[PDB]
Amino acid sequence: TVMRELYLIDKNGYVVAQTLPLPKSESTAKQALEYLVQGGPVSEILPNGFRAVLPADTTVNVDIKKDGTAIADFSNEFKNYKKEDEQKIVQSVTWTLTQFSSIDKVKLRINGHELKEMPVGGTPISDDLSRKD
């Protein structure tokens, strides 16, 4: 296994970094996002009191560009979150991706559509989400 940060939601509802041991992978950014999905492989290794963040059955493609941007393009299930978790989800995805050496910012898509706003509640989002946010 390899130590990775997963930005999970704790017993008090906060998005908090947790270090988990993930199997070795040739697509580590995608893998880390797969370990944020409710009901996915993180389920067996969640630390006490923590939960996963992305809706069940969400899948994703991560395309890492030469400028440091990771384009994370989610399946339609990604729309199935609770409104009030909208910004926590953006933060979790952003912080989880930007741990990697080749990613310093994030752009979100759903079903290959570019996102100006998150779908459930309309939170505006830029194409250069980063830890500065």
Residue 17 engages Na ion in binding (rule: CB under 5 A): no
Member of 38, 87, 91, 126 binding Na ion (CB under 5 A): 38
Number of CB atoms found within 10 A of residue 35's CB: 23
> CA-CA distance, 1 to 39, in Å (whole number)?
20
Member of 98, 105, 110, 115 binding Na ion (CB under 5 A): 98
> CA-CA distance, 87 to 15, in Å (whole number)?
10
Within 56-85, the residues that bind Na ion by CB under 5 A are: 56, 68, 83
> CA-CA distance, 76 to 84, in Å (whole number)?
19
In angstroms, give the least distance from the CB of 115 to Na ion.
19
Q: 105 with 111: CB under 8 angstroms?
A: no
Residue 130 engages Na ion in binding (rule: CB under 5 A): no
Residue whose CB is less far from Na ion, 49 or 122: 49
For every residue of 59-101, DSSP letters joined together read -EEEEE-TTSEEEEEE-GGGG-S-GGGHHHHHHHHHHHHHTST
In angstroms, give the least distance from the CB of 28 to Na ion.
4
In angstroms, give the least distance from the CB of 128 to Na ion.
13
| DSSP label at residue 42 | G
In angstroms, give the least distance from the CB of 125 to Na ion.
19
Q: Which residues bind Na ion (CB under 5 A)?
A: 2, 10-11, 13, 16, 22-23, 25, 28, 38, 49, 55-56, 68, 83, 98, 102-104
